[PDB]
Amino acid sequence: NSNICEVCNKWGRLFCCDTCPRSFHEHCHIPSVEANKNPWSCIFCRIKTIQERCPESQSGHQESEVLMRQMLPEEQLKCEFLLLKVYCDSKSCFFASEPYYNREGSQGPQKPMWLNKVKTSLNEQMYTRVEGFVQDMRLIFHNHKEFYREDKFTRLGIQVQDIFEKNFRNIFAIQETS
Ligand SMILES: [Zn+2]
Ligand SMILES: [Zn+2]
Ligand SMILES: [Zn+2]
């Protein structure tokens, strides 16, 4: 097994996957690493098992159809993974915790959002459809773009949103387009 957390790339108290070499801190893994279970399979392994059970799950899909799916166990897991892939980027630190807004010439967003909030919302099963989750994720970056206006810091929103968007297309097998 790896000696660093797959998500944050640090050493510390790690839990090792029993079916791939990845390792995690407890709260970096999503969901948080389970108390017992031996063997333990990480979310990367769980996601690969879904695909292997239903190879056809990788055929192209319309986003509009994906968003209306109910958050049954497999969609819950795919949203958990997609959230994890964002946390995997070091630039997610800017969006993890609750923001605040006091900049001359800007007003804060009406509906603040941040990754730890979405994490909690997933943990507490507050989303009934994939759309719920994806809207809050997109909101995080949109609020950032709107607040930082022409400051070059707005590019952080673009960058992290691109990581989201690519992973959303991958995870939910969205039909490739030109
Ligand atoms: Zn970590
Ligand atoms: Zn694994
Ligand atoms: Zn099948």
Side-chain angles (χ1 to χ4, degrees), residues 1-36 38-178:
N1 290 84
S2 179
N3 300 341
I4 57 178
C5 179
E6 180 82 1
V7 179
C8 73
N9 307 105
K10 297 294 193 286
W11 181 67
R13 180 69 191 90
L14 302 167
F15 297 89
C16 291
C17 186
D18 287 310
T19 51
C20 71
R22 303 177 173 87
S23 309
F24 301 86
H25 295 98
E26 176 168 23
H27 297 317
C28 282
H29 193 275
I30 308 175
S32 292
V33 170
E34 297 71 3
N36 208 290
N38 318 62
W40 181 72
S41 270
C42 84
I43 187 162
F44 293 80
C45 287
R46 294 169 70 190
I47 290 287
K48 188 211 307 312
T49 298
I50 305 315
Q51 287 176 13
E52 287 175 350
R53 284 177 170 152
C54 293
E56 69 272 31
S57 70
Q58 306 164 272
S59 293
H61 296 91
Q62 297 306 114
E63 177 171 312
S64 67
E65 178 266 320
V66 167
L67 294 184
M68 297 311 294
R69 297 178 189 172
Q70 294 180 6
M71 292 282 263
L72 295 176
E74 293 195 347
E75 309 310 305
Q76 175 78 27
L77 192 83
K78 284 180 175 213
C79 289
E80 290 163 348
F81 190 51
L82 171 45
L83 185 55
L84 177 132
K85 289 286 194 156
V86 172
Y87 281 102
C88 286
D89 200 277
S90 65
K91 296 158 177 282
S92 72
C93 68
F94 298 109
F95 299 110
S97 76
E98 187 170 4
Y100 66 83
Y101 302 95
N102 192 5
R103 168 184 200 249
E104 179 180 331
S106 288
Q107 271 303 321
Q110 302 300 316
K111 190 182 170 183
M113 191 52 60
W114 58 104
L115 296 166
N116 291 342
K117 199 178 166 59
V118 175
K119 181 174 284 196
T120 292
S121 302
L122 274 170
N123 180 235
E124 291 176 3
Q125 303 164 306
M126 302 297 292
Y127 299 115
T128 58
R129 291 171 199 273
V130 171
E131 180 178 50
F133 165 83
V134 173
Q135 284 170 341
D136 281 352
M137 297 290 290
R138 289 178 170 159
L139 182 65
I140 294 172
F141 316 114
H142 188 254
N143 285 342
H144 177 105
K145 289 165 104 166
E146 294 305 302
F147 183 71
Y148 292 106
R149 305 298 194 102
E150 317 298 290
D151 194 300
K152 70 196 163 162
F153 194 62
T154 61
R155 183 158 167 266
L156 275 293
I158 295 161
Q159 287 173 324
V160 188
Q161 175 158 23
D162 191 42
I163 294 295
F164 177 73
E165 294 299 340
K166 286 179 187 271
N167 282 280
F168 172 69
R169 292 192 303 266
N170 181 255
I171 293 165
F172 290 91
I174 293 299
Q175 175 53 53
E176 290 271 304
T177 55
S178 63

